[PDB]
Design a protein around this nucleic acid. Sequence first.
DNA 1: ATCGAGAATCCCGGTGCCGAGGCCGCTCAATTGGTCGTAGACAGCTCTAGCACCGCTTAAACGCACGTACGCGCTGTCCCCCGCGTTTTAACCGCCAAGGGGATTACTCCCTAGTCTCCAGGCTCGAGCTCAATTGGTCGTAGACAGCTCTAGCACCGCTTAAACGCACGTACGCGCTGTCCCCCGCGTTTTAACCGCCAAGGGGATTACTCCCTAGTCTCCAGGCACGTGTCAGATATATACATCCGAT
DNA 2: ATCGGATGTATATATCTGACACGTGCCTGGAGACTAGGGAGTAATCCCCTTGGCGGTTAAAACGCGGGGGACAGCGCGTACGTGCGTTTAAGCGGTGCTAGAGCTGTCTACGACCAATTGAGCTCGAGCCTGGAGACTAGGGAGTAATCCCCTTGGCGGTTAAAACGCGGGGGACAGCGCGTACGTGCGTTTAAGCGGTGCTAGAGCTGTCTACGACCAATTGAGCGGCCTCGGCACCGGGATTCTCGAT
Lengths: 90, 90, 89, 73, 69, 77, 78, 77, 102, 103, 102, 96, 95, 95
Amino acid sequence: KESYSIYVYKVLKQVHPDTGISSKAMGIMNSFVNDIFERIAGEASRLAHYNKRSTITSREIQTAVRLLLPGELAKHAVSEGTKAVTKYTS
Amino acid sequence: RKESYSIYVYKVLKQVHPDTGISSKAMGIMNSFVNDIFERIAGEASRLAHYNKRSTITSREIQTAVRLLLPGELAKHAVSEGTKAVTKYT
Amino acid sequence: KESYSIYVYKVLKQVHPDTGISSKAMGIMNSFVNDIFERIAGEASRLAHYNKRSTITSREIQTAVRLLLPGELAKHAVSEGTKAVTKYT
Amino acid sequence: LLIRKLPFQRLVREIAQDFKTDLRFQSSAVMALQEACEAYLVGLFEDTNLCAIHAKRVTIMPKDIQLARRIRG
Amino acid sequence: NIQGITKPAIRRLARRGGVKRISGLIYEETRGVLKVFLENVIRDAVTYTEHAKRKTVTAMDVVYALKRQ
Amino acid sequence: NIQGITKPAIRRLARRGGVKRISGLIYEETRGVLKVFLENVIRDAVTYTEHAKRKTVTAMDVVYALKRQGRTLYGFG
Amino acid sequence: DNIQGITKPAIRRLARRGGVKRISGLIYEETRGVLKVFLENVIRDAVTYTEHAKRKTVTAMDVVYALKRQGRTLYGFG
Amino acid sequence: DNIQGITKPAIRRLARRGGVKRISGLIYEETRGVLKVFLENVIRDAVTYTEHAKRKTVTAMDVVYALKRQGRTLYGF
Amino acid sequence: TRSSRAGLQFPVGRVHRLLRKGNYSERVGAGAPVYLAAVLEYLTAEILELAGNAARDNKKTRIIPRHLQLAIRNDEELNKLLGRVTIAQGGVLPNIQAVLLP
Amino acid sequence: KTRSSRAGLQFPVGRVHRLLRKGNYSERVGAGAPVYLAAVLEYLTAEILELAGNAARDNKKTRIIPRHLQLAIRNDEELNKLLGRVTIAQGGVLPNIQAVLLP
Amino acid sequence: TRSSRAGLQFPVGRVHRLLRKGNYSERVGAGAPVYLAAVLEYLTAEILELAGNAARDNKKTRIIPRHLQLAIRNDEELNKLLGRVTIAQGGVLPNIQAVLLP
Amino acid sequence: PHRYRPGTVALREIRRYQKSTELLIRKLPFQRLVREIAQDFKTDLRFQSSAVMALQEACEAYLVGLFEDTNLCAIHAKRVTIMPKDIQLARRIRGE
Amino acid sequence: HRYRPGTVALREIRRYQKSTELLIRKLPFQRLVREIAQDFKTDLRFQSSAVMALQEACEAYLVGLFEDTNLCAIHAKRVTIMPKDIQLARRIRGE
Amino acid sequence: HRYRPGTVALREIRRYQKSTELLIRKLPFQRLVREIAQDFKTDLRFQSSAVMALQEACEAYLVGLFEDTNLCAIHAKRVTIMPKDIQLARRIRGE
DNA sequence: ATCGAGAATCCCGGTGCCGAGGCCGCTCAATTGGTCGTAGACAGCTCTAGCACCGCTTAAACGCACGTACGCGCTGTCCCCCGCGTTTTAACCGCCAAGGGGATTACTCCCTAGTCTCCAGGCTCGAGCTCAATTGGTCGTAGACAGCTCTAGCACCGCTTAAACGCACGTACGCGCTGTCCCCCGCGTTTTAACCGCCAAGGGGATTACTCCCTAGTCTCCAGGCACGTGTCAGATATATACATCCGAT
DNA sequence: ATCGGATGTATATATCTGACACGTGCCTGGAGACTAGGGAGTAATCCCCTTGGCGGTTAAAACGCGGGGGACAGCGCGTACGTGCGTTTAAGCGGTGCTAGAGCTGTCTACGACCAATTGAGCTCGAGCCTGGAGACTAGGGAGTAATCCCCTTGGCGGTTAAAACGCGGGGGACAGCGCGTACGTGCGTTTAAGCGGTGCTAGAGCTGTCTACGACCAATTGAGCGGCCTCGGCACCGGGATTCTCGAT
């Protein structure tokens, strides 16, 4: 059974090196990741459909992020994602 | 010069319905019908004569062919008409 | 009492040298050959009558074959017939 | 439609201007926006009225609207 | 420009909602509420427009915006 | 004599036709259908027999009847 | 693409004469395919007769004969 | 009559978490009705999902999907 | 003429010629074309009788294809004889399935 | 030297020709017509016998019986069309069960 | 791994597989799962950051659901995102309306 | 305004079109179909008018009969709407 | 041991489509043929092969009719053939 | 000793907003859940975590609903919640 | 309301250990790179349209004094009715015990393929004939040669009649569920057809005397077919009349 | 299900005209005696075996007789698909006005095929060989059927933290009751704008080319996840303080 637990735990060590997390909390984090995954991917699919495009690219993901996230959360997520895609392309 | 059954069908019509006429299309359908039944009866009679190693089609082959081709009560009347006609002719 | 038995057997020996055929199967082959003969001859007869022609030629047979046989069977039958008439001629 | 056309159009153009420059609008986009705003206000006023009657009043007040909007989320 | 949604217009909307009497302070509140709603909807609509690489907000974008809230 | 076309025979015929379940009413119905078929074929067959001035209906007559009813039979030529 | 000339209302009329009261949307395209096959089969036979007579005009008799030999004998065009 | 297991003191505790200090005697029965309606609606959808999956055991995911599709997404299961 | 000797309206001589030239057999008996003319006449008379009746039911004095189709399809034995026959401009018999009615 | 041999055929050109003359089909029959007809009949016999032999070999029999003829004819679309209204004596039917009847 | 090339912690390959098998679209660009993984990672990091903050305020080194509820509800934008979301065992924030106090 | 219930006008149309005999497919588009199909067999063919009219009679009679059989198949399945599977059953049992 | 309803039915379908032997008993069919013939012509005799021909033709006709009946039954989402199926098959065949 | 009306209610408020434990008894709720499910389809079983999930959902729904009822009560310058408060809260939610 | 005393309720601090968490490790399987193409997916360009920008107009919308009766917030009393302590009562939790499936495993039985033995069933060797090849003269039937005159095809133009495109929206298909029925599987029964034998002649199947039925060619005399002037039921224009059919209302 | 009114339909009816029978002139191929020619079906006659009728036997199957399950006729509800309506547009159609390929017929002529001997040759039936698929058996695999399994179900009662409930009692909430003030019309001036025009123009929806990127296999794989074990942070309990309400007073 796959989950995001280990990646969440590594992130926890990045943000709080000496802090742990309970099993229930890790389950809540995994639920969270799946919800946001579904919301963004589904909305991006809808954008692509709306524009008669058959491919979901980083642009639909970016626009979905702008629709779903509030204010500074959307801008910060877009900045991180953009840096990541440009670094990947290099 | 194109021969047809039009005048004979019309004479029969006047026998059966003295004050009734008939359209050209209907006369064409009657002619097609007569040719069709002609073909059916003659073909069955030819086959009958062949089947029996006979070289002559007589009123007997025609009568049996008629019995094969015409249904039931229609067949009895047709056989009756043919027999009366052949006996009067002889 | 005529039949096609010996000719069917010759064809069988051409296509399957070590294969035989039962009496019932040979009878069915004779029925088949007679049937197709009647079909082709009858259609050719109707073609000739329809066109007020008194002669059945290889052309009447060929048109009858095109009417009666489907697709590849018709094409191959016409090919075999044409080859045979040219070889005979 | 119950709001006058031209002031709503002007409001739409003014509000739209602080997000992206040089925009134009299809007519049917503005009628769509008008249908949406008016439907929302009618529904919101329905909720305010239920909140007012709950408080044994017949006069709508800002506090009714804020309660309706808070419960709506 | 928010002041173009006049007092009698808000009154007509309140009548359609079945409201018989309206406090003087309602009007500014309604204007604020309207501004917030409009801002949100148009933000989504224009976001969709930019995705389509268009400069014209279309009716389908607005309807789509309405659907997603 | 129609009852001589027994129930298990009709079931077997249906089995060859791929039928898995058979209502109880098929058998009588099938028998009626069967009777009609036989009558028709024999009506032609006996006519052929009568045409030949014979008293024995032959297999060929039946084959000819079947051919002329659009039900050509192979194997009895 | 002349098969599209067999219009939706035409298929409805044919079905009405056939006693059909309600018609699924997919019938029409299906019917068109069936019709095309029929015509092909008929016209094929017709053209053979036309070719056999060394003529360039398909006649009414060619069609009547094609129909007869396909078991769909038609009266009235002899 | 299992709805009576949602006791008066339990409803009191639930109201307390909502910050309620005083509760009219008629709230509890009203609350009971409301709760029952909610449950039916959730469980109905859950069971529908179970039936689509041709299962006889309602799973946590079935329930999560029911809540999501009624706009009450639940985290942790 | 042979038709008058046999009491028929259809042409016995013509039917005889068509038998001779239809390549049916090398020889044709003398009674065969009389019989054929009689059978053709009887069937023609039956169709025309019934079709005329149908025409009068429709208050028409001229038989048109509709009356022939009605006549043929409304008679079980004629319908059987012409089971695989298309009557041009015939239409179909009026018939609505009971399940389709309100 | 027979005409069938000249035509490269096994089926009897002479017999087919005589059968055409005596079948009351036309007053005259051209010389090429029975050759063509015999060739067509031989082709069809060979095609059916080819398939029936194949079916016989699948069944490990050295003699073709009616069952193999039924399999050969019904599993070939064009032969089945040609013999759509033909009964092969002692042929049986093709094994075939509609999917809805299987468990 | 693609995550290392993209500088991310969430598994781009895994996100890509879930996008492929979630029947979201016929085709998927190479950047979409990278972006998606990055966004999910960012939001996870923010919630874990705030929940950790709450945990230290309560002198607890282990995050439990209560800290998630406090973190989410005390942040307006996270509260908006999870406005219709139930955090199991989260409870509620202490809050008494002023008119109710003595 | 007045509105007839679903089926009343269908039945009325059935009575109307079973009463009459005029061809129901448009002449010229059908003619184009015939010429296209024939041209895909032999180029530059011509047609007599009565040949096309014959084709029209044959096609309409075949389809009307086929639709009768489809309707009987529908009634067998306790339906009133004809479906492609009805056409396929009718043609399978006819032997086409 | 007991096989479930249908398993043995399928076994018989496979069995009888694999084989070719005639499925109606010889003597009752012969009795039927003579009975029917007597109502058409007196004093008739029959060759053995004539009766065998009749058996092959009747059984082939019935198997084919049962095939069509089965297709009609399946069309109505049933697996059991009923008289209405036979009458529909025969009506569409034109009998 | 006697506390005045309201003091213990507030103390209870502080207690239950501080904690996270489930507030309905496990087993009676379980019987309720099985009864309701059984009235849709007979003989169903339930995984334990399904009942725990249903209980979390019901209690979260009720606590939120009681929050809205309290807002409606305070709006009407009352401190006691009554059925009309529930009716208003659910009407405005759109339930 | 703000001292002051006092108790309850909770908070804090300190500790016990254990189990939920952290962490390694073997693997194994979900993950990643090497190579092919098929494009879908985007870049460039273009006609269009509808969308922005601007002047009267008159008129409806709005905006502004006025005053006023209609609430609404603010206190007062009552009573009302629901929460807290104390107590009793107890199902619920603890916490356990036993029965209990969904399942493929692990067995079991019958179906369906491999393996010798023995023929009826074709497989080869010789015997006298009906079918097949030749050319010849001898007809005819069919195939080029040449019209030629039509009708089948090519383009113009109303126009309307039908076909195409939405537009409610309501019956139709369908689909899961369900009670009873009714028919398939299994087995004893009790036939009764399959296998086998007997005798025979009635009719199939040839064999021939034959005579009479129908073809074949010719001719006299013809009805049936090709043109062809013309009132007519038929086709098309208005009508009223029920004739149905759709929406209240028994 | 009907009793009626409101419309939209064919029906029963009256009128005008028009290609269509249709009756007519007449013109020619076809026809039917005719007398034989001869050649075929008819009618004894006669023989050989095929199909019966029947005696006769047996063991395969039919035929009841139950059991049970699984199938079919319903049914109530979902959703949704095609329909009848109306409006707007597209092309079929009747009317030209042509026009040249090819159906139709007429010459004619020259191939081509057929009885007629006629010359002969494969074909077909005995007759006697074998030997290959029935058959008669065997063995392993097709499946069905219980049926233990560890893990989750169902039932179950002792002690005990939780649920009633009751009396009290003391604070809400509800209605009365009012006084002020403030929105709601109510009427008059304005002023802003829908709408009608008109202008130019940007972008957008579409069309075409094409190529960069992603799908999409395989083989190679190392990182995640169960499995297990090591561990110390904090859930829970004992002992003592902060705070925290709570009554009296004035």
